[PDB]
Structure formats: C-alpha cells, structure tokens
C-alpha cells in the first residue's frame, strides 16, 4: 500500500518472470499503479529483461517512464543513473535511435 512494501512485494513477485508475456504482464500491472516506480524496481526490470532474452521491452520500459516521469528533472535524473546502468546494459534511447 505504501512505497517500500510495494517495492519489496512486487520485486518478489517480479523475480518470478521466467517468460516473455509473464514479465511483460507483471511489468504492465506493476507499472500501472498510483505511484512512480522505484529505481530498484527498474533495475530489477532491466535485469529481468536480460533474463527473458528480449531487447525491445528493455526499450519499452524507458518510454513508459518517459511518459510517467511527470517532469523533465526526474527524467534527466533517471537518464543519469539509468545512463551508467545502460553502459552496463547496452540498451539505447529511442531518441538515440530514430526508428
């Protein structure tokens, strides 16, 4: 219900990924609540994206937080911490990609 028990409970439910649509469904519903996601939740999200053998959902989580990030300042802060996380990940921005 609060911030921290949310983070703990759905990271525990989130390391039960094992699959494509399972990790994508738990990403959907754990993203669609009434709180911004914790950075630890998105680190487990990128690690589960490495586990489930799929790259474009690791792009999709970033445009999802680009919508939900509610300002530009938290967006640049997430760009910083998620930037050196990308350097240890290998995932591109859409703005770096131009489809």
């Amino acid at each position: 219900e609060t911030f921290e028990e949310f983070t703990a409970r759905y990271e525990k439910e989130f390391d039960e990924a094992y699959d494509l649509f399972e990790v994508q469904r738990v990403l959907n519903n754990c993203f669609s609540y009434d709180l911004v996601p914790a950075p630890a939740v998105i680190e487990k999200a990128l690690r589960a994206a490495r586990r489930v053998n799929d790259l474009p959902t690791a792009i999709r989580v970033f445009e999802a937080l680009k919508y939900k990030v509610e300002n530009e300042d938290q967006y640049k802060a997430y760009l910083d911490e998620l930037k050196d996380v990308r350097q240890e990940l290998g995932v591109p921005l859409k703005e770096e990609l131009f489809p």
Binding site: R50, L55, P56, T57, I59, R60, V91, P92, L97, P99
Partner: protein
Amino acid sequence: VMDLQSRWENMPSTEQQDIVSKLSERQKLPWAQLTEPEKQAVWYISYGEWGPRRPVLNKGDSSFIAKGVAAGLLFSVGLFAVVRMAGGQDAKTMNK
C-alpha cells in the same frame, strides 16, 4: 555470420512481406552488437503499428469525417430549402 545483412533495412517502410515470420525467426541474442539499423527491426516488428496498435482513425480519414459531416449538413439544409417555402402569414405590413 550470425548477424543480419541489410536485406530490408527500412522495416517501417513495409510489412508487405509475406513471410515476416522468417525474419522474426532470424533474430538473435548477443546484446549490443546488434547492428542498430536492424536493432530498429526488433522494436518495430515487436512494437509497430498493424493489427494491434492500429489507430482508430487513419490520417486520411479524419478530414473525410469532417468533410462528410459538413456535406450531409449542407444537403439537409439545402433539401429543406428546396422542399417547401410557401403560403404563410398575410403580410409583413399586417404584423407592423
């Protein structure tokens, strides 16, 4: 070997390919040696716009909607004008 070959590098240009499923089978997993002109391909193929995520109104259609509304309204008002305007009150002077 093991990487794609610019067979069709503009994936948002066509999904007119018959067997797209071979191109989806083609995909791999070494993670960031993916040759970004076909790392566009996995995002577009898995997340593009056809079937699901097709907009309700296409770009051409919205102008057709407003045009058809105005044309139907004009045909209604013109039909009202050319059905009947005849035999009313006595005269404007009588109202005066």
